[PDB]
Amino acid sequence: SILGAEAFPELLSKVPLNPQMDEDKHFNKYKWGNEPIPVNRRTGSRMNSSIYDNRNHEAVRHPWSTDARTFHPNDNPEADRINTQYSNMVSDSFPEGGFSDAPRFSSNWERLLAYHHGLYSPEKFNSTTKTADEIRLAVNDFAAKVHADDPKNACKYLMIEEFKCLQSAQARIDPQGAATKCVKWFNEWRQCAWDQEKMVKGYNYIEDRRARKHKPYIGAPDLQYS
Amino acid sequence: APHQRAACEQLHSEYKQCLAKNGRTHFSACTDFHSKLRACENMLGTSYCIDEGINLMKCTKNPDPSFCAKEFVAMRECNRPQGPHLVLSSSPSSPPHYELRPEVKHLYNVDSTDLGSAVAPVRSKEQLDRVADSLKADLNLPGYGHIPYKWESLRPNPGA
Amino acid sequence: VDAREMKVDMYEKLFKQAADLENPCRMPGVAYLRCLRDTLTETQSARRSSCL
Amino acid sequence: AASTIPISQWPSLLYAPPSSPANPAVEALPEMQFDDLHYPRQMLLCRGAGYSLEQCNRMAQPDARVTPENPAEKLLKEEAVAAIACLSQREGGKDEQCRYYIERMYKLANKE
Amino acid sequence: STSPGLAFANLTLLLDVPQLPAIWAVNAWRELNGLFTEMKTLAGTSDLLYPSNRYNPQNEKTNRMGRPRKYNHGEWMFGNSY
Amino acid sequence: SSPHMDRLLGDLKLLAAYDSAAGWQEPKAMESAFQSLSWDDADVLKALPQYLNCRGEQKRRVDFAYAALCPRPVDEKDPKQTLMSLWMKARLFSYDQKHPFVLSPFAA
Amino acid sequence: QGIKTVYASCRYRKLNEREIISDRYTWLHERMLEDEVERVLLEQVPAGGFDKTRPGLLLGPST
Ligand SMILES: CCCCCCCCCCCCCCCCCC(=O)OC[C@H](COP(=O)([O-])OCC(O)COP(=O)([O-])OC[C@@H](COC(=O)CCCCCCCCCCCCCCCCC)OC(=O)CCCCCCCCCCCCCCCCC)OC(=O)CCCCCCCCCCCCCCCCC
Ligand SMILES: CCCCCCCCCCCCO[C@@H]1O[C@H](CO)[C@@H](O[C@H]2O[C@H](CO)[C@@H](O)[C@H](O)[C@H]2O)[C@H](O)[C@H]1O
Numbered sequence: 096s097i098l099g100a101e102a103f104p105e106l107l108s109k110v111p112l113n114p115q116m117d118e119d120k121h122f123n124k125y126k127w128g129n130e131p132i133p134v135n136r137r138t139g140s141r142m143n144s145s146i147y148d149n150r151n152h153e154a155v156r157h158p159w160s161t162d163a164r165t166f167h168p169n170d171n172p173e174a175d176r177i178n179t180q181y182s183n184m185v186s187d188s189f190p191e192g193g194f195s196d197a198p199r200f201s202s203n204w205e206r207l208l209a210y211h212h213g214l215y216s217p218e219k220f221n222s223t224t225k226t227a228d229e230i231r232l233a234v235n236d237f238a239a240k241v242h243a244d245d246p247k248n249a250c251k252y253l254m255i256e257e258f259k260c261l262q263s264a265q266a267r268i269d270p271q272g273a274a275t276k277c278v279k280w281f282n283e284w285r286q287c288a289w290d291q292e293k294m295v296k297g298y299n300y301i302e303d304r305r306a307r308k309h310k311p312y313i314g315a316p317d318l319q320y321s
Numbered sequence: 322a323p324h325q326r327a328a329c330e331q332l333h334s335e336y337k338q339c340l341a342k343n344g345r346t347h348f349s350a351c352t353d354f355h356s357k358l359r360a361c362e363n364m365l366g367t368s369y370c371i372d373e374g375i376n377l378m379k380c381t382k383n384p385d386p387s388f389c390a391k392e393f394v395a396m397r398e399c400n401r402p403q404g405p406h407l408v409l410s411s412s413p414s415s416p417p418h419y420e421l422r423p424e425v426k427h428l429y430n431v432d433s434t435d436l437g438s439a440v441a442p443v444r445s446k447e448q449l450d451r452v453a454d455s456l457k458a459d460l461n462l463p464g465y466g467h468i469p470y471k472w473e474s475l476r477p478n479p480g481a
Numbered sequence: 482v483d484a485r486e487m488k489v490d491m492y493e494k495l496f497k498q499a500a501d502l503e504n505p506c507r508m509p510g511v512a513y514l515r516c517l518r519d520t521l522t523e524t525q526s527a528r529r530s531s532c533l
Numbered sequence: 534a535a536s537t538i539p540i541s542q543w544p545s546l547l548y549a550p551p552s553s554p555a556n557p558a559v560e561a562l563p564e565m566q567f568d569d570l571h572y573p574r575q576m577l578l579c580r581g582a583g584y585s586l587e588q589c590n591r592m593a594q595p596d597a598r599v600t601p602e603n604p605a606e607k608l609l610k611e612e613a614v615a616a617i618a619c620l621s622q623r624e625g626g627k628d629e630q631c632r633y634y635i636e637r638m639y640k641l642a643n644k645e
Numbered sequence: 646s647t648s649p650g651l652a653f654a655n656l657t658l659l660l661d662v663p664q665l666p667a668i669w670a671v672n673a674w675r676e677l678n679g680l681f682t683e684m685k686t687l688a689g690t691s692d693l694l695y696p697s698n699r700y701n702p703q704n705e706k707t708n709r710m711g712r713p714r715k716y717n718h719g720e721w722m723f724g725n726s727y
Numbered sequence: 728s729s730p731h732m733d734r735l736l737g738d739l740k741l742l743a744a745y746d747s748a749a750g751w752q753e754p755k756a757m758e759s760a761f762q763s764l765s766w767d768d769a770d771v772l773k774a775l776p777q778y779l780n781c782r783g784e785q786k787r788r789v790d791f792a793y794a795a796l797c798p799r800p801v802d803e804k805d806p807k808q809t810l811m812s813l814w815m816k817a818r819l820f821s822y823d824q825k826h827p828f829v830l831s832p833f834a835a
Numbered sequence: 836q837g838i839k840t841v842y843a844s845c846r847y848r849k850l851n852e853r854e855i856i857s858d859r860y861t862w863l864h865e866r867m868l869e870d871e872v873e874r875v876l877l878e879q880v881p882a883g884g885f886d887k888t889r890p891g892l893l894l895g896p897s898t
């Protein structure tokens with residue numbers, strides 16, 4: 096009795112699940128070959144990024160022992176990146192399988208203390224990257240909930256966009272890096288909140304008369320702005 | 322006296338209705354109701370903000386440089402059900418102060434009941450210097466006033 | 482009616498600060514308060530049948 | 534030709550992906566949903582109503598708010614069944630043995 | 646007369662001196678609108694009018710930004726809520 | 728001795744391969760997958776017309792499972808994708824009508 | 836321009852006064868509505884007030 100007879104059609108019919116498998120098993124059904132994803136991009140550890148940090152490009156220090164070999168983003172990518180899907184794009188900034196800095200705690204109180212001091216979250220350390228489908232599902236659920244909360248709100252799509260950008264930047268495993276990208280939509284939402292409030296509660300101000308040189312040149316048109 | 326309580330509540334509603342119908346410009350027409358409302362107050366231990374509203378109306382047509390702020394806050398604090406939380410201390414002192422009732426001190430983020438003067442300070446070189454020195458002492462920054470380069474001139478402060 | 486609007490606004494502000502979008506009861510609470518806003522100019526007897 | 538997509542253009546890449554031989558319905562990508570809170574919320578609501586765990590599990594039903602169904606499965610029913618029969622008989626359509634049905638379906642769906 | 650070196654001035658003149666009547670007309674229209682606004686203000690208004698502002702939609706049932714007034718269904722003892 | 732499990736896992740692998748080959752622009756590989764996608768299963772063939780006419784709780788269970796496995800909406804114009812989706816749904820329908828699914832975490 | 840500027844200065848002074856008073860009246864209106872709501876709420880307080888020593892809802896044992 097053999098194990099898994101009808102379960103390896105990929106092997107029976109030389110069907111590669113990816114160019115890496117194609118190159119390995121020598122099926123040669125990918126016309127464009129394969130450019131291997133190097134190990135520094137397949138795995139690695141979290142690193143400091145800012146140039147205004149002294150330990151820049153150095154691995155992040157944790158209470159537990161950690162391999163300090165870092166994930167290197169793709170800084171000099173090739174001109175042709177035939178697969179421009181999220182699957183192949185995410186590997187340039189994160190490792191699909193997650194970082195290699197996860198702990199195996201010898202006890203429960205060590206885990207407790209790390210969490211209590213803000214140095215561990217399983218959501219952040221024991222996890223992979225999110226697939227495009229998962230990101231879209233989360234975004235659409237959040238959008239439905241926001242619409243149900245209030246349809247006649249102006250900052251709705253702004254909140255949805257900051258959520259979307261966090262999910263796309265993988266804030267679960269890179270919260271600081273993702274906030275660095277989403278704080279702009281947060282700020283726009285703040286502005287829209289003030290604007291909606293001032294439109295609801297009539298808030299206006301006495302505008303001063305028009306300046307003597309409002310137009311730089313007499314022949315120039317003074318486009319009227321509300 | 323629940324009958325009397327209901328009667329006076331109806332009277333107060335009628336007074337409000339007449340005052341709204343007349344407007345805050347013509348408010349001297351509804352003086353008829355004071356006779357009964359003051360008796361209501363003296364009987365039921367209740368208040369109705371009569372003098373406060375009248376003073377506010379009178380002031381907002383001939384306003385004060387303060388723009389009737391004290392009248393506004395007085396009316397706002399008097400219309401409260403359980404009584405005013407914030408008051409203006411009656412004092413022989415020249416500058417009056419804003420005081421907070423003790424029974425409501427636990428609702429406000431304060432150490433004492435004195436919330437400061439009810440008028441802004443007067444411009445004074447001495448007070449400015451005092452505040453600046455206090456801030457410098459609290460900061461304790463070695464490097465304040467240091468001038469690495471100054472335009473060479475017979476004048477001590479070139480420009481300024 | 483103005484005081485009813487104010488009371489409903491207070492309820493909504495309090496409940497929205499209390500319950501976040503991840504909370505399950507947020508949508509039902511907001512829906513009930515929206516029904517109240519819709520039925521302000523009514524009596525409790527007529528509002529119950531609609532908001533129950 | 535296919536240039537790198539920076540990390541700032543990924544939100545638009547998710548809802549407007551590039552063209553591929555097997556594209557999704559971009560107009561329907563905002564409609565793909567799969568609620569992870571369905572059964573927890575159902576149980577919470579029922580237990581708050583006052584039912585027991587067994588009653589809740591008997592009354593539970595799968596989520597209907599999922600990704601909509603393809604209208605082709607109802608419009609091109611007969612053609613799809615015929616194509617599947619052809620495939621089952623001809624080993625998956627090797628060396629273009631179901632081109633007939635596949636092209637009929639493609640024409641019906643595309644119309645030039 | 647003219648010359649190639651005067652192309653700047655020729656173009657500027659040809660395109661601008663015909664606009665001076667329209668500029669003067671715009672100025673006169675602005676003056677008349679200001680006059681009418683001031684006459685209306687003198688006549689009287691429920692809510693104030695901002696003179697140098699583009700549009701003033703405020704009335705008894707409309708905020709100073711075009712939205713309905715909140716808490717305006719009933720009546721108030723001190724009169725208008727504004 | 729485990730044909731259902733084997734063919735399920737194989738079909739999943741082939742769907743993944745089709746998606747990858749589409750992303751990498753490989754018609755040869757994706758057609759190889761489509762051809763290898765187990766079209767000669769009598770049980771699924773017999774359940775196909777049953778699924779095409781089912782309705783109600785069974786259909787909702789099967790659609791929930793198919794959204795769990797393949798939530799992305801296929802293009803309404805690609806007959807190959809449509810057919811692979813139909814085949815996977817028919818397989819799930821056969822498994823369900825033999826032994827129904829229990830999708831709730833709460834159960835006993 | 837000087838005549839217009841004098842007239843505008845007077846008008847702007849009056850307008851500033853009116854705007855301040857109007858905003859403060861709006862503030863007062865809102866605060867009075869809040870006071871009415873509070874007066875109606877205080878009727879729902881049980882006789883003797885609240886028992887601020889214990890929790891309103893006891894939602895578990897203490898063994
Ligand atoms: C040969 C021609 C004639 C030569 C002589 C001309 C110079 C006459 C002036 C002499 C006075 C100099 C003062 C000396 C005391 C020290 C102060 C000082 O010097 O600092 C000034 C300055 C440095 O200042 P600083 O470092 O910034 O520090 C303090 C500030 O200066 C000052 O502090 P502040 O910033 O707070 O002050 C601000 C404000 C203070 O002042 C003011 O506010 C107003 C001052 C203006 C007063 C106007 C007059 C008032 C009139 C009232 C009456 C009106 C009615 C009657 C008149 C009617 C008129 C018709 O502005 C000024 O400072 C004005 C200063 C002007 C400097 C002199 C400019 C001339 C440069 C040299 C020109 C060389 C020409 C070619 C030579 C050719 C030789 C081959 O240094 C110089 O000016 C150097 C002067 C050198 C003279 C050289 C003469 C030629 C010698 C050739 C040697 C060969 C080698 C040379 C190399 C090239 C070879 C080819
Ligand atoms: C010891 C003797 C002292 C003599 C004192 C003489 C005092 C003379 C004071 C005149 C001051 C006029 O000041 C100037 O006038 C014009 C109109 O008149 C104003 O108005 C001008 O600018 C403002 C906007 O910029 C608008 O009103 C308008 O666009 C224009 O008319 C200017 O805003 C003001 O800066």
Ligand SMILES: CCCCCCCCCCCCO[C@@H]1O[C@H](CO)[C@@H](O[C@H]2O[C@H](CO)[C@@H](O)[C@H](O)[C@H]2O)[C@H](O)[C@H]1O
Pocket residue numbers: 303304305306307672673674675676677678679680696697698699
């Ligand atoms: C027969 C009508 C009168 C014919 C003569 C018209 C001459 C008008 C040109 C004078 C210069 C006007 O230049 C500028 O335009 C208008 C006034 O016109 C003013 O504009 C400002 O005050 C006017 C009040 O009238 C407001 O309507 C306007 O919202 C405000 O921006 C500026 O303060 C002034 O600096």
